[PDB]
PDB file of C-alpha atoms and ligand atoms in Angstrom:
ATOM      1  CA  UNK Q   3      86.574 123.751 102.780  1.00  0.00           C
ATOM      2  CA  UNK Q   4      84.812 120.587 100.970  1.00  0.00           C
ATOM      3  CA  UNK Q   5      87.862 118.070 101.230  1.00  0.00           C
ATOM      4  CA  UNK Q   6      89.526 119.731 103.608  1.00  0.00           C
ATOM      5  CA  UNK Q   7      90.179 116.732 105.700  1.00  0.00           C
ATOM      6  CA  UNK Q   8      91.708 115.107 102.334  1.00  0.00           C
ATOM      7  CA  UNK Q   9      93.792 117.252 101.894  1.00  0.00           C
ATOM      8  CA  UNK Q  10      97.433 116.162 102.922  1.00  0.00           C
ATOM      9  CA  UNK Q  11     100.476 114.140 102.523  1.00  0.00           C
ATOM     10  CA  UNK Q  12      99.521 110.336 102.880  1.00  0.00           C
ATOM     11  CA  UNK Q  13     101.886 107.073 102.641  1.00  0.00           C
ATOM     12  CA  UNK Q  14     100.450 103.816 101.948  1.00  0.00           C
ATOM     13  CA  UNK Q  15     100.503 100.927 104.941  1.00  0.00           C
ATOM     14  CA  UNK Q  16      98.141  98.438 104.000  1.00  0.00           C
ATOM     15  CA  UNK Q  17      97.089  96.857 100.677  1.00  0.00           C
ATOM     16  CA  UNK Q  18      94.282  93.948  99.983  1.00  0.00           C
ATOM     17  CA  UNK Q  19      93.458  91.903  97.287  1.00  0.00           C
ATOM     18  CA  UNK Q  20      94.922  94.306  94.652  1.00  0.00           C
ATOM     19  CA  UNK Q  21      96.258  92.036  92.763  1.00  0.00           C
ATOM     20  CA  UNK Q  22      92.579  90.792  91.819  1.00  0.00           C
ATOM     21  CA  UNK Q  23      91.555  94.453  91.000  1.00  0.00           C
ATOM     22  CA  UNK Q  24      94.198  94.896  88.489  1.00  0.00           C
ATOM     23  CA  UNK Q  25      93.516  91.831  87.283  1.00  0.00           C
ATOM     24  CA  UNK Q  26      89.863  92.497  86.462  1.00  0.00           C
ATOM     25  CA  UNK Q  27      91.048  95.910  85.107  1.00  0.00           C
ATOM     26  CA  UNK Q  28      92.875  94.042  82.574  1.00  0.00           C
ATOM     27  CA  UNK Q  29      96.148  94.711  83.772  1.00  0.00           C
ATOM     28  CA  UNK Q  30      98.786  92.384  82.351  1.00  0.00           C
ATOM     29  CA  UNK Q  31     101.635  90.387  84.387  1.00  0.00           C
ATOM     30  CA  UNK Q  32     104.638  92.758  84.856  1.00  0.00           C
ATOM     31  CA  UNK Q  33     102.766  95.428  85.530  1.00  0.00           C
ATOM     32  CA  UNK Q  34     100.646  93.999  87.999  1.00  0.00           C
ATOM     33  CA  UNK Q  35     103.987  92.444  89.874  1.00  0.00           C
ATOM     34  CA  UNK Q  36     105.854  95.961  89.953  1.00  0.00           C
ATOM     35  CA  UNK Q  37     102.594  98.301  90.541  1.00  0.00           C
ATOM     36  CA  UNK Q  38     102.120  95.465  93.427  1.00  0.00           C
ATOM     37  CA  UNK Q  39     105.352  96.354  94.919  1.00  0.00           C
ATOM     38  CA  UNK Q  40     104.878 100.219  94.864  1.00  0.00           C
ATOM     39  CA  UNK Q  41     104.576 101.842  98.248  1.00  0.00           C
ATOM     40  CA  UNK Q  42     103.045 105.163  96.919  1.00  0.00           C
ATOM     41  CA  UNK Q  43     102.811 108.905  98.460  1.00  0.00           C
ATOM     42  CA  UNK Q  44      99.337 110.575  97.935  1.00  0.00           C
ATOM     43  CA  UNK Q  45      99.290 114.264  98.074  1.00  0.00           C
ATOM     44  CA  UNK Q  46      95.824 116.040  98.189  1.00  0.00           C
ATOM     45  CA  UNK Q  47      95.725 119.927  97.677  1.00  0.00           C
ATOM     46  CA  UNK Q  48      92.886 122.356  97.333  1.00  0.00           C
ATOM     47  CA  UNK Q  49      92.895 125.515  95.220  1.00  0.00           C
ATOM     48  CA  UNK Q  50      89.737 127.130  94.863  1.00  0.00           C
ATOM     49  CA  UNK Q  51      87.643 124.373  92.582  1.00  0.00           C
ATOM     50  CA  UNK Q  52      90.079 122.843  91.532  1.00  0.00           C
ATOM     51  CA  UNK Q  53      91.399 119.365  93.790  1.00  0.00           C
ATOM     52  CA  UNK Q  54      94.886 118.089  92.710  1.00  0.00           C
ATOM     53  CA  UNK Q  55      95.490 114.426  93.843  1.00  0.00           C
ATOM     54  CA  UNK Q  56      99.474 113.358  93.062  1.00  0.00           C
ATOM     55  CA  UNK Q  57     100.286 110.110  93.289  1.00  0.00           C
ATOM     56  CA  UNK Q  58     104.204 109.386  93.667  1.00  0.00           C
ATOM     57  CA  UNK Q  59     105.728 105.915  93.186  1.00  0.00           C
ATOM     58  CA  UNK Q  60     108.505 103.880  92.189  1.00  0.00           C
ATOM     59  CA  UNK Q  61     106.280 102.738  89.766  1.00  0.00           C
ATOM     60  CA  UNK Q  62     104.850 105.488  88.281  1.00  0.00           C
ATOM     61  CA  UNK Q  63     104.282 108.718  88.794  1.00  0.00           C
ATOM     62  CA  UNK Q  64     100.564 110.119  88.609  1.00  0.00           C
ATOM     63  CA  UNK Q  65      98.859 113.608  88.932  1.00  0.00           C
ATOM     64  CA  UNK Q  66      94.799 114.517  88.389  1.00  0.00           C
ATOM     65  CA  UNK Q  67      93.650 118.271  88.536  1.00  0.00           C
ATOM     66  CA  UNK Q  68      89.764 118.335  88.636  1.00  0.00           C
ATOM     67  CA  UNK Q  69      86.682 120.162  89.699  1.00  0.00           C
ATOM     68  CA  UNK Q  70      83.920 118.156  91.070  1.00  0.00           C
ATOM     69  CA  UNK Q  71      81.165 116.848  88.691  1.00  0.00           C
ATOM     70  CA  UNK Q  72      82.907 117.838  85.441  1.00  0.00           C
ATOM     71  CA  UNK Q  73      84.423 115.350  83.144  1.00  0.00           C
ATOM     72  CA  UNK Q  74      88.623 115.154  82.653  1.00  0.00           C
ATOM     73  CA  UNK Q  75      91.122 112.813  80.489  1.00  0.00           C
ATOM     74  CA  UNK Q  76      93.321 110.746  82.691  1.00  0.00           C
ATOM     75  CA  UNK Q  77      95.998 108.619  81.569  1.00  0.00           C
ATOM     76  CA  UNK Q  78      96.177 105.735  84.780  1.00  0.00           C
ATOM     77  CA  UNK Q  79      99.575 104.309  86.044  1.00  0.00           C
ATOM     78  CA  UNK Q  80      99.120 101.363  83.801  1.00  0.00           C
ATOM     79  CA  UNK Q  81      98.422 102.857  80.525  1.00  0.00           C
ATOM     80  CA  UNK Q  82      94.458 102.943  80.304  1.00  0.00           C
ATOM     81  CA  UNK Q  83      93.326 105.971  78.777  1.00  0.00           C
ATOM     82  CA  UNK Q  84      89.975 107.324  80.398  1.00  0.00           C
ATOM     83  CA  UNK Q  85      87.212 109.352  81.113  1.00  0.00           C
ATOM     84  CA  UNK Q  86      86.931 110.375  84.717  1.00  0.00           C
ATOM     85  CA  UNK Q  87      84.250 112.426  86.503  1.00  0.00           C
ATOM     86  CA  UNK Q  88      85.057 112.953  90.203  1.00  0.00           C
ATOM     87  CA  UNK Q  89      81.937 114.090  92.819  1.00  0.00           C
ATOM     88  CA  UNK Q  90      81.369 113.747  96.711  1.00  0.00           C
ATOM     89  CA  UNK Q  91      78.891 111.860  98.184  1.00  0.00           C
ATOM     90  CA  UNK Q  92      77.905 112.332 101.639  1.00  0.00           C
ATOM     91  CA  UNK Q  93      81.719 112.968 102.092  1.00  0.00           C
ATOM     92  CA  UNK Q  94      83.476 110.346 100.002  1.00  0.00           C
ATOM     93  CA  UNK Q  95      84.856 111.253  96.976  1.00  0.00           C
ATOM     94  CA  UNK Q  96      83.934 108.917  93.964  1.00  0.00           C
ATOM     95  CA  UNK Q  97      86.089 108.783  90.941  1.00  0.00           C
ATOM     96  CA  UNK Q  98      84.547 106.938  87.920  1.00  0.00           C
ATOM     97  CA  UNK Q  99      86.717 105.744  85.232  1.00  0.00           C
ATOM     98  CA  UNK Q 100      85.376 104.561  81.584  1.00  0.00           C
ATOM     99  CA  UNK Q 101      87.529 103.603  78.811  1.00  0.00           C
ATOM    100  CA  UNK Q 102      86.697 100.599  75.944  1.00  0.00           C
ATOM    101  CA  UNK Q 103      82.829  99.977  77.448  1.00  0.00           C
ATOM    102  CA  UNK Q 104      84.003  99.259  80.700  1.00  0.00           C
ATOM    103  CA  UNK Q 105      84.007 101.061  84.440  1.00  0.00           C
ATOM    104  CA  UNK Q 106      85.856 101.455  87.494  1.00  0.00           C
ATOM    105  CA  UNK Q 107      84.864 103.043  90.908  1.00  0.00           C
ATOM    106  CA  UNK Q 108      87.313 104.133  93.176  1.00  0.00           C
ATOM    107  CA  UNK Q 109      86.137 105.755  96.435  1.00  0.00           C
ATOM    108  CA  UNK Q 110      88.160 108.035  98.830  1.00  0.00           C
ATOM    109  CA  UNK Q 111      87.065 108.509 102.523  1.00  0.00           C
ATOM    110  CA  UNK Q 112      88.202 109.470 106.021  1.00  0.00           C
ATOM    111  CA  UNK Q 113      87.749 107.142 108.960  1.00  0.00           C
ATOM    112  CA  UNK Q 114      89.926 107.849 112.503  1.00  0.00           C
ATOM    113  CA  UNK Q 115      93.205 108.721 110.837  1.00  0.00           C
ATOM    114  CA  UNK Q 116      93.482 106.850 107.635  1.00  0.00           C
ATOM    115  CA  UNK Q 117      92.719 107.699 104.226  1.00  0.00           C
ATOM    116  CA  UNK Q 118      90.873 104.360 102.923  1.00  0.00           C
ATOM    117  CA  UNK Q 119      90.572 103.771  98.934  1.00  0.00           C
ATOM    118  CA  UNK Q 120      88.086 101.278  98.009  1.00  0.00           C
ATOM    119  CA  UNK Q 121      88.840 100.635  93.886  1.00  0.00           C
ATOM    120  CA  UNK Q 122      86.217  98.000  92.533  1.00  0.00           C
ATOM    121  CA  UNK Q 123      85.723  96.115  89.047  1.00  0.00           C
ATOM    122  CA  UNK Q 124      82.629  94.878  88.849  1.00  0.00           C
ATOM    123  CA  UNK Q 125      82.625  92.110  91.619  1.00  0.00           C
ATOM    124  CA  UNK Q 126      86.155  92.515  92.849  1.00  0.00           C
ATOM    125  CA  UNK Q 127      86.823  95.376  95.404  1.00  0.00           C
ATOM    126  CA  UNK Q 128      90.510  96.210  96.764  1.00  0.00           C
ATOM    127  CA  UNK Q 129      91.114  97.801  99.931  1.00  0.00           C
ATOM    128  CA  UNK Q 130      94.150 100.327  99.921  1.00  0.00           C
ATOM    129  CA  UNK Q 131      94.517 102.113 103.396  1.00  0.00           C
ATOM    130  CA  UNK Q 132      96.523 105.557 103.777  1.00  0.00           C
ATOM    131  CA  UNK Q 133      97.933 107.080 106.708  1.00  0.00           C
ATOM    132  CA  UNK Q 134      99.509 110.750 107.108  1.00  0.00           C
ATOM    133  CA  UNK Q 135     103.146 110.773 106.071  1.00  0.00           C
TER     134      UNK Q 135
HETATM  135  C1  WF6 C   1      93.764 105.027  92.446  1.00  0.00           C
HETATM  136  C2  WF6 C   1      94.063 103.578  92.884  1.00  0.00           C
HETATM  137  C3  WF6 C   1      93.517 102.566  91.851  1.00  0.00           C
HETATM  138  N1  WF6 C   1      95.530 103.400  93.127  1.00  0.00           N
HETATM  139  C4  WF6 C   1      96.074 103.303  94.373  1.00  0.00           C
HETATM  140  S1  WF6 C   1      95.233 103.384  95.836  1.00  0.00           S
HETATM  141  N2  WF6 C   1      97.381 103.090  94.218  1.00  0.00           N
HETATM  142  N3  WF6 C   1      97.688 103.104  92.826  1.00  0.00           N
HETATM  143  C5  WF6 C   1      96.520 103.289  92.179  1.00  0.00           C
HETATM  144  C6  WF6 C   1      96.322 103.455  90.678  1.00  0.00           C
HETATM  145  O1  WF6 C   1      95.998 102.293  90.020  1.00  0.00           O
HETATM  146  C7  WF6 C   1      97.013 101.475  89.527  1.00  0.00           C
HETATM  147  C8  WF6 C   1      98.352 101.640  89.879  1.00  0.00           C
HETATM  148  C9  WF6 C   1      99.239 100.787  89.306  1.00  0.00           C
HETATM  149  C10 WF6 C   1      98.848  99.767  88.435  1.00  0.00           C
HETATM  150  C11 WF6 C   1      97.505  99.547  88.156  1.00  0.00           C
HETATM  151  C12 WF6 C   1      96.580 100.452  88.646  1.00  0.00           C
HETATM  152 CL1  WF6 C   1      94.945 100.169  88.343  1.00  0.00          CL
END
């Protein structure tokens, strides 16, 4: 019952300074304009362990199968090939992404009804907000 209030079909309505994020990712031009435009669908399921977050696009389509605190190959939308370990913390799930000496953090919480994503490079933080579908 860990994520249970993750767990779900959830439609993006609100994006902030994204653009900035993928830039400091290292994302190049096209990329960053199309993944911009992308509206995605995030679906969340629990089976036993094991936490399956989809992520489907018009830009790309993206799927992670994990168990918390144990370390998984992910190939990101835009191309990066990395190492991601996945844990809660006092109810927020925090992904952590290496690949080439460098680190992302995206964190996943639950405030009111929204699903908020908070995806940070170093200084730069974006703001992605969910809501149910
Ligand atoms: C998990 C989080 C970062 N995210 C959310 S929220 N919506 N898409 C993504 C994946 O990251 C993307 C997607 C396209 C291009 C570049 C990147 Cl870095």
């Amino acid at each position: 019952h860990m994520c249970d209030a993750f767990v779900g079909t959830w439609k993006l309505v609100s994006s902030e300074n994204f653009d900035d994020y993928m830039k400091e990712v290292g994302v190049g031009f096209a990329t960053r304009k199309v993944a911009g435009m992308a509206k995605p669908n995030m679906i969340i399921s629990v089976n036993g362990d094991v936490i399956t977050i989809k992520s489907e696009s018009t830009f790309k389509n993206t799927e992670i199968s994990f168990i918390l605190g144990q370390e998984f190959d992910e190939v990101t939308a835009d191309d990066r090939k990395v190492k991601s370990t996945i844990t809660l913390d006092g109810g927020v799930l925090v992904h952590v992404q290496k690949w080439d000496g460098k680190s992302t953090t995206i964190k996943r919480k639950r405030e009111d009804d929204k699903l908020v994503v908070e995806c940070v490079m170093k200084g730069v933080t974006s703001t992605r907000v969910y809501e149910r579908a």
